[PDB]
Amino acid sequence: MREEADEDFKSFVEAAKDNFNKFKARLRKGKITREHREMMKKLAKQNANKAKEAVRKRLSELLSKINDMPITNDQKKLMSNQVLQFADDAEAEIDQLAAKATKEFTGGSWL
Amino acid sequence: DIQMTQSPSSLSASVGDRVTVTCRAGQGVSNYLSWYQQKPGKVPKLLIYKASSLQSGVPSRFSGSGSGTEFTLTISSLQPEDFATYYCLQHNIHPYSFGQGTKVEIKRTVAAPSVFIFPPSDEQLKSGTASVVCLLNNFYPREAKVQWKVDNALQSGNSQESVTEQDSKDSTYSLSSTLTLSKADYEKHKVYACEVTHQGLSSPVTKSFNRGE
Amino acid sequence: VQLVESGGGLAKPGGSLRLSCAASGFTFSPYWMYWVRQAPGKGLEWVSVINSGGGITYYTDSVKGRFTISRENAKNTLYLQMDSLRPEDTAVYYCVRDRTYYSGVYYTEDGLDSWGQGVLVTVSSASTKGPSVFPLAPSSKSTSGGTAALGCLVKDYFPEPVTVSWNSGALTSGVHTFPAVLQSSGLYSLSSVVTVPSSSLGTQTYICNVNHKPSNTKVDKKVEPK
Numbered sequence: 021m022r023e024e025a026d027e028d029f030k031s032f033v034e035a036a037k038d039n040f041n042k043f044k045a046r047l048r049k050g051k052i053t054r055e056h057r058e059m060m061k062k063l064a065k066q067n068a069n070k071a072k073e074a075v076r077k078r079l080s081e082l083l084s085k086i087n088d089m090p091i092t093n094d095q096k097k098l099m100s101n102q103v104l105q106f107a108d109d110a111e112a113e114i115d116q117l118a119a120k121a122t123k124e125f126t127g128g129s130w131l
Numbered sequence: 132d133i134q135m136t137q138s139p140s141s142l143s144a145s146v147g148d149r150v151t152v153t154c155r156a157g158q159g160v161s162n163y164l165s166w167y168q169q170k171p172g173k174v175p176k177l178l179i180y181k182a183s184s185l186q187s188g189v190p191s192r193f194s195g196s197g198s199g200t201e202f203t204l205t206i207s208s209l210q211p212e213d214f215a216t217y218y219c220l221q222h223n224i225h226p227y228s229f230g231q232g233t234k235v236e237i238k239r240t241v242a243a244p245s246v247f248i249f250p251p252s253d254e255q256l257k258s259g260t261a262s263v264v265c266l267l268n269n270f271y272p273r274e275a276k277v278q279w280k281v282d283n284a285l286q287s288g289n290s291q292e293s294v295t296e297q298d299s300k301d302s303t304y305s306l307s308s309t310l311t312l313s314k315a316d317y318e319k320h321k322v323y324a325c326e327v328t329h330q331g332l333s334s335p336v337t338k339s340f341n342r343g344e
Numbered sequence: 345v346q347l348v349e350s351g352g353g354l355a356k357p358g359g360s361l362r363l364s365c366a367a368s369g370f371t372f373s374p375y376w377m378y379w380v381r382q383a384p385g386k387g388l389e390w391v392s393v394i395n396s397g398g399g400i401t402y403y404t405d406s407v408k409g410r411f412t413i414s415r416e417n418a419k420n421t422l423y424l425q426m427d428s429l430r431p432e433d434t435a436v437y438y439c440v441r442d443r444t445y446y447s448g449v450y451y452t453e454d455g456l457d458s459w460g461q462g463v464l465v466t467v468s469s470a471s472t473k474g475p476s477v478f479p480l481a482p483s484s485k486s487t488s489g490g491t492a493a494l495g496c497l498v499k500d501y502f503p504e505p506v507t508v509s510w511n512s513g514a515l516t517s518g519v520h521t522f523p524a525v526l527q528s529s530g531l532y533s534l535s536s537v538v539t540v541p542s543s544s545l546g547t548q549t550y551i552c553n554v555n556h557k558p559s560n561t562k563v564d565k566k567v568e569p570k
Contacts, residue, residue, distance in 0.1 A: 083448065093444060099446075169388070175438075181453065226404075227390060264480055291527070295520050
């Protein structure tokens with residue numbers, strides 16, 4: 021079924037959620053300069069980009085699987101659009117996890 | 132595989148006429164019906180995919196319609212170069228399956244055949260067999276009759292005919308008839324005649340040669 | 345963006361052949377591939393299907409177990425091993441590409457759009473024989489020479505096909521190469537003719553180029569008047 025795909029991309033977001041939690045806990049606490057803050061933000065985006073290519077690599081595999089199954093071609097098309105929407109949602113939340121990892125005015129750091 | 136049922140098996144039509152070819156699927160194929168055009172001795176050409184989508188470079192006079200199990204190829208104004216066999220193809224589910232094909236013929240004005248006769252070559256006579264060939268060139272319609280005469284005596288059962296496919300431009304046919312005799316039989320007679328009857332001829336046309344020359 | 349086919353030809357009943365199909369100019373891996381055959385003078389019909397290097401394969405009822413459709417995506421080549429050949433396997437075989445793939449952001453669903461030139465498979469116990477070529481000399485003379493007909497008689501060969509050109513292909517207007525006829529001796533025979541201005545009979549050479557590949561027979565017969 022497509023439930024395999026829905027959980028596949030949902031598994032990536034949970035991993036990103038755990039990975040970004042440990043990322044935040046290891047950021048320097050206290051009064052930081054400002055150059056240091058963007059250094060934190062580029063790493064959060066670098067970590068989000070790595071988690072996102074795992075999503076796309078998985079998206080390409082299932083698409084190859086969808087086209088190669090003995091189903092009606094109009095059923096290839098909609099399944100390809102739903103699995104694309106699953107991966108798009110996964111990439112959006114991963115981006116949201118990276119942004120909120122360096123959110124201003126939390127307990128962590130300040131200027 | 133889904134069973135495609137196409138009709139008619141063949142049809143005839145004049146230049147400028149509207150032509151319709153019907154395709155029917157055993158199961159629903161939704162929007163995934165293709166139309167192919169195949170001219171004699173050539174690779175099939177995809178004209179229309181998705182029932183109503185025209186491939187690149189395909190003339191605008193071609194159009195398809197229908198969805199579900201009833202489809203229809205339509206040539207709005209038939210052209211001489213449209214002579215071909217047309218096939219429908221469902222591309223909804225593998226394996227894709229074809230129809231029986233529709234053979235489209237062109238109707239045109241009557242054209243009388245030009246007739247030519249050929250004696251056997253001296254090279255072939257060395258082998259002990261003589262082939263006499265008669266040519267009926269660029270005529271319409273297809274029906275024609277060739278009668279072989281040897282010294283004005285009718286021949287039977289010693290000739291074979293072959294007909295060309297309809298010409299893509301003048302819509303005419305051409306026909307060859309070959310009379311096969313033994314060298315001894317060929318050499319004992321004199322006048323070899325090819326008598327052609329055709330609707331374009333007011334009366335039979337005869338082309339002949341004397342074995343002497 | 346073509347497909348070239350190899351193999352095929354004459355084979356005795358029960359023998360085996362195998363067709364290759366080299367693809368180029370495009371992405372061969374993701375598309376389903378078809379083998380389509382056409383018996384002489386009959387319609388088109390699918391014979392075998394296969395996926396993007398997968399284990400799903402279709403075969404029509406006429407060919408179960410006998411033919412196996414192979415495929416690899418590295419060399420971009422399609423295959424059709426043909427075992428236990430039967431007289432009704434005589435057909436022109438095409439390898440076709442299904443330009444159908446759905447990627448979400450983009451898709452194509454043209455269907456079977458790109459075909460190979462085709463290959464003839466002839467199944468018969470009859471032995472190969474090369475033809476003889478005889479001239480069909482123009483009538484000498486037409487009154488003025490108002491259009492003359494000339495040609496070549498390609499007699500007694502097996503199997504199909506033979507191709508006939510005129511003046512190495514430069515003369516195509518007015519050419520009629522007739523369908524071969526099956527003589528009672530089991531051998532084929534066809535005539536190819538061309539009509540020309542017969543003011544050109546004296547100032548032009550006319551050669552028919554007969555090629556019978558199955559017997560390696562190549563003949564350039566010059567056709568002269570008288």
